[PDB]
Amino acid sequence: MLTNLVAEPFAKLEQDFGGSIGVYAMDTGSGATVSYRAEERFPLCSSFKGFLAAAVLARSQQQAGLLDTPIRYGKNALVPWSPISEKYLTTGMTVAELSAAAVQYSDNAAANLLLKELGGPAGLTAFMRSIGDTTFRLDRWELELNSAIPGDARDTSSPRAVTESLQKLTLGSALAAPQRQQFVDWLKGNTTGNHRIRAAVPADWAVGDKTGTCGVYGTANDYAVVWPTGRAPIVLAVYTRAPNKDDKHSEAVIAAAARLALEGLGVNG
């Protein structure tokens, strides 16, 4: 029913974009949903870093002091787009600071160092299985996971699975209350998503998000929890990809898809 209210505008939006758009949006009050290509796999790109921080927070529930552990690293850890960790190369950073940098600045060195602590891509995948997500898979590290090859299931999930897992971690019971609020707070402080889902959200609504940009195959994404005033929160995921390696992603398309999802849910804004 709501999936059909916006099916036609979604098709026109993705045809103008020149690729595929995948959207799943959930109104946590009524349970109403909007779907468009919601079961197709899309590359995660940096969006896995949000789930990575949730996995760290989950581990901190039964390993006190994990968040305060100092991590030291060498120049060889600094891969492109490590804007925070490059400033602390000579000092180290704590696990919590690496997690905040991974979430709020998409810091690649920070993400790789945290992946190391959790047992690599299989360890993060294992965490996702532990919360009931059978779709998510991480296979590689930054930046190899950005290849976004058409048809390749490595380092992908579906918009529906991303939304379902995000709901469990931010609003459900997958994390304990203090860890859940810390995860929400990190997403709320993200600096990389101002032109994506946030561009669709009114100023007086709270929003936390995590972005991903593979840099090839028109592949980019964003997922978010949105707290409209006066109603229950909305969880949504917007993923894109395109057939040609040189196709460019579009933040404006991500924002436009988020607007249609919110319009479909009847969320005025």
Ligand X SMILES: Cc1cc(Br)c2c(CP(=O)(O)O)cc(=O)oc2c1
Q: Report the C-alpha gap between 255 and 257 in whole angstroms.
A: 5
- In the residue annotation, 46 being an active-site residue is answered as yes
Q: Which is nearer to ligand X, 105 or 228 (CB)?
A: 105
Q: Which is nearer to ligand X, 9 or 123 (CB)?
A: 123
**Cα-to-chain-centroid distance, residue 151:** 20
Contact 211, 106 (CB under 8 A): yes
Stretch that binds ligand X, among 73-81, 151-159, 160-168, 174-182 (CB under 6 A): 73-81
Q: Report the C-alpha gap between 70 and 95 in whole angstroms.
A: 6
* Site membership for ligand X, residue 116 (CB under 6 A): yes
* Site membership for ligand X, residue 89 (CB under 6 A): no
Query: Does the annotation place 116 within a ligand binding site?
Result: no
Comparing C-alpha atoms, which of 123, 107, 122, 124 is closest to residue 73? 107
* 61 three-class SS: coil
* Site membership for ligand X, residue 123 (CB under 6 A): yes
Q: Which is nearer to ligand X, 45 or 262 (CB)?
A: 45
* 222 three-class SS: strand
User: For ligand X, what does the binding mask look like between residues 186 and 215, x meaning CB under 6 A?
Assistant: ------x------------------xxx-x
Which residue from 4, 30, 63, 130 is in contact with ligand X, where contact means CB under 6 A? 130
Which residue from 26, 58, 95, 256 is in contact with ligand X, where contact means CB under 6 A? 58
* Site membership for ligand X, residue 55 (CB under 6 A): yes
Tokens matching residue 225: 């929890």
* Site membership for ligand X, residue 219 (CB under 6 A): no
Residues 6+ apart with CB under 8 A from 64: none
Comparing C-alpha atoms, which of 174, 144, 185, 192 is closest to residue 55? 174
Q: Catalytic pick from 20, 35, 46, 99?
A: 46
User: For ligand X, what does the binding mask look like between residues 34 and 53, x meaning CB under 6 A?
Assistant: -----------xx-------
Number of H helices, E strands in the chain: 9, 9
- Helix H or strand E encompassing 144: none
Q: Report the C-alpha gap between 1 and 137 in whole angstroms.
A: 30
Nearest-CB residue to ligand X?
46
Phi, psi of 247 (to 5 degrees): -65, 135
* Site membership for ligand X, residue 127 (CB under 6 A): yes
* Site membership for ligand X, residue 113 (CB under 6 A): yes
Residues 6+ apart with CB under 8 A from 112: 77, 79, 141, 142
* Site membership for ligand X, residue 141 (CB under 6 A): yes
User: Which active-site residues does the annotation give?
Assistant: 46, 144
**Residues at the site binding ligand X, with contacts judged by CB under 6 A:** 45-46, 55, 58-59, 77, 80-81, 106, 108, 112-113, 116, 118, 123-124, 126-127, 130, 141, 192, 211-213, 215
Binding-site residues = 46, 49, 81, 106, 108, 211, 213
